[PDB]
Amino acid sequence: QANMGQFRAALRRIMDDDDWVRFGGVLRTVRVKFYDARPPDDVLQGLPFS
Amino acid sequence: QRPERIKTTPYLEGDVLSSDSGPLLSVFALQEIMQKVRQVQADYMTATREVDFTVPDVQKILDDIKALAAEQVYKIVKVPSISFRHIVMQSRDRVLRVDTYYEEMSQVGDVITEDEPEKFYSTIIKKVRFIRGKGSFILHDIPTRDHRGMEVAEPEVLGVEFKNVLPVLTAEHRAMIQNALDGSIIENGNVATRDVDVFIGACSEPVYRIYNRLQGYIEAVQLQELRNSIGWLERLGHRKRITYSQEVLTDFRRQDTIWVLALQLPVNPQVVWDVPRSSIANLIMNIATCLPTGEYIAPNPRISSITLTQRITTTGPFAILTGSTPTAQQLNDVRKIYLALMFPGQIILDLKIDPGERMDPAVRMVAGVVGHLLFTAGGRFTNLTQNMARQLDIALNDYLLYMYNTRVQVNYGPTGEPLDFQIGRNQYDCNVFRADFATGTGYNGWATIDVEYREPAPYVHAQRYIRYCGIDSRELINPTTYGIGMTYHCYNEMLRMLVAAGKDSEAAYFRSMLPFHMVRFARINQIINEDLHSVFSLPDDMFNALLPDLIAGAHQNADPVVLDVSWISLWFAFNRSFEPTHRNEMLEVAPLIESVYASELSVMKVDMRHLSLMQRRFPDVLIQARPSHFWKAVLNDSPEAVKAVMNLSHSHNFINIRDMMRWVMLPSLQPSLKLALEEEAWAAANDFEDLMLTDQVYMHRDMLPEPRLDDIERFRQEGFYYTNMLEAPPEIDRVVQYTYEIARLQANMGQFRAALRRIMDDDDWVRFGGVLRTVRVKFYDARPPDDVLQGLPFSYDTIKYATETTIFYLIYNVEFSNTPDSLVLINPTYTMTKVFINKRIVERVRVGQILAVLNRRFVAYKGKMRIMDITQSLKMGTKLAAPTV
Amino acid sequence: DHRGMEVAEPEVLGVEFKNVLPVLTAEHRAMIQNALDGSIIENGNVATRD
Amino acid sequence: QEVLTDFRRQDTIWVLALQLPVNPQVVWDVPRSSIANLIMNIATCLPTGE
């Protein structure tokens, strides 16, 4: 997807399609949190990839 | 991270004895080889050609190879050079046209002399370099100008100069010249997003041919060849099993980028391997390149003894020999043994005796055992020679023979060969442990398979995988049998004999010792399989031919290199292990290096063949030709790096004609950009007339024309001219042929001058040709000296039949106050030299013909265009985002 | 080396005639020159050695 | 055999003045030399110990 030069556009199209993405099969470490206000932008708007 | 380097048991760990790397081992190996032959030469009397022996620096030559790889053979200039030159005589309507390229050709090189063959070759190949240098250029950022809203080009990029022509023109004349300048336009000039500037004009024909194939080369090679190259790099990386950069290459190309490549990354190894007397060179670069950084490990101290209490403890059977430490020479011998171990087949060992050293007899007693347990001397190759194999047999016989405990019975056999007897209670036969090269008993390669074939290999010359002691390398990632179950046949027979020999403690020590031995050979199997895969390696044909060659005494082109070690060094090497804690760094740039190597080799072969052509083409010029002449001629003007590579063999003082010509006729080749330009330059050079190597020389009675001076200004406007040059040869009847040998014969008889005067009186032409002569054209307005106008092909030192002569063009200049008979002379001036060149080198053109040469198409890029060399970025750390199909 | 052939030396011939050349004539010099050109070398073998 | 095993062994011509086979009959054929053979034998070959 990065190779041909249509990586991000496909992701934006699929997100317009309102779908779900299971990025990788590698297990991830989870965390639990509690807040009284809005969370920071970094944890909310962030992407699970780089 | 790599699973075979992690350890969890207290048996394979100990203090490190020493460390080593490829660079030290290479120079050391060359040193002992050269010292051996020097001692050989010194210890006796020798009568041969003198030769000095110095050890070279491999690292310097590798650095110089890397530097030369960065050298670009292409030049970029905005403007092309001047193609044609104009000359103005007294007539302002007619002007002389000359080619500057021909005059520069005349200046490039030196004169012809029939006595000097290699000088002739050197001059010719200098012409070749000059052709390729003036042919290789790319135009970028051409200037442009605007006239009446239209695009025009400048009068200095078209390749002609005519600024001094403007004063001699009248109104219509510079009117039409400026009209022609306005007509000199750049095509496709109305494109708003234009990137190419295409122009019509003149150029030198070889130069323009090289330019045309250069732009064809630009258009041809593109990204898919890079894809193939990096795919082969991936296959090599898979073979070596290196970690990859998590960066992945995506073939997205910018709209304002140009890549250039001068190498094809797939390689033909036979081009490398066909060099005469070069096997040792291939081995030394293989050592210098593929060998990683490693170290020597001692075995666990607890194998020989185990404690039981404070005071009582077991002792080793070889306790007296265990407490020993090698010297410098013994350490060097250990190195030699491990080198012979790491390369099987092309390295031979030997055993050194000299009175200056003293040892206990037990060194040979145990040395026979360690020799039979430490080398392989049978199967499909060899590692030993016959004499030391017999010595080891005698040693093993004496060890089974000298026994300190209560004696057992022995039954001797018929012959006096050692090991012809039976021993002990079980009556075991020791005769099976004699060494024969065809069978291979008594060593690690007996009763097993030593070499095997698998899937296609990255390099095509050798697909083999070496299997020492019948064990592969895949048990380290996943073991196969239990701890006791690891064994092989010769080890079993050896242990069973020692049990049969009544010898028990030694058997226990060896049975403990076995897994260290097997894992050491597993690591060496991995090293041979993975690390050493390179173009310098020995192909399968040589490896499968060497053993019959040595056992049959057949005459071989690639002699195995014979070395020498000491006796106790075998036992010391038995108590060590090699561990490569890191891999070689220059391995990461290994392949492309030899590519440059290969490419340059191709170049030599190319012009080599062309030089041989002249020996067939011209016997008289090359009467005294010896092919070493052109050999040395090419070998002078060449990069010193590859020459040092070949002279590391030091056989350059031994190269004969047979090896050199056997190298000549092969057409094996690996393409490269400068190579392609080389073939095309030599294709232009197949027409020998392109380098002023003419052989048409005519002589007859001729005189300078004497025009009658009627009107001075009429003579000014006309502009009469003369030349001794022949624009075309005359008819054949008046021309008589003449040769070198007949010239020599008539010179000895002395009637040659008489024959010249006879035919000279008969007023017919005479030919002196068959030998290439240089061409000089220099313009003389006044009276020349006699030597230029009277160019006699015979030159008194006897005579030499071929001589160079400067070709004359005479321009006539007159004044108004000259009398009508001022040029009238009572004795007419005479000339006799005439030459034919078969091209319009000098010619008179009327003013409208000044731009009559613009018929050739040139391509240039905009100044915004950037050119980046991309030869340097071919490294196996680059992995494709879209892998090769 | 001349005429595409390796040629021996008058010294290795084993005979000396170097004090009779200057009194010779043209024909004798030409004949001795041709005869010198006549001598050849043979690339033979013994025990598989050149 | 070290001197027979350099890397220039293949294209070298050897010279030996003495043949190894020493036909023993020629030393024995010497008339009334038995005592001389004995004394020079024990001169050249007899070792000494303690």
GROMACS .gro file of C-alpha atoms in nm, chain B residues 79-83 142 153-160 162 180-181 184 199-203 851 853-854 858:
model
   27
  129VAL     CA    1   2.775   2.373  -2.456
  130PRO     CA    2   2.912   2.139  -2.725
  131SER     CA    3   3.254   2.213  -2.869
  132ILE     CA    4   3.333   2.372  -3.205
  133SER     CA    5   3.273   2.123  -3.485
  192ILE     CA    6   2.122   2.524  -2.288
  203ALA     CA    7   1.930   2.961  -2.973
  204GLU     CA    8   2.267   3.131  -2.931
  205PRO     CA    9   2.549   3.117  -3.190
  206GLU     CA   10   2.800   2.965  -2.947
  207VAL     CA   11   2.603   2.649  -2.867
  208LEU     CA   12   2.541   2.548  -3.230
  209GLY     CA   13   2.909   2.457  -3.265
  210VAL     CA   14   3.035   2.714  -3.518
  212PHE     CA   15   3.126   3.328  -3.749
  230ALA     CA   16   1.963   3.212  -4.064
  231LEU     CA   17   2.023   3.291  -3.696
  234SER     CA   18   1.815   2.849  -3.600
  249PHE     CA   19   1.833   2.135  -3.160
  250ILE     CA   20   1.954   2.088  -3.518
  251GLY     CA   21   2.318   2.150  -3.599
  252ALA     CA   22   2.655   2.001  -3.680
  253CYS     CA   23   2.881   1.765  -3.486
  901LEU     CA   24   2.523   2.694  -4.241
  903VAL     CA   25   2.611   2.153  -4.220
  904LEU     CA   26   2.314   2.162  -3.980
  908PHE     CA   27   2.107   1.711  -3.024
   0.00000   0.00000   0.00000
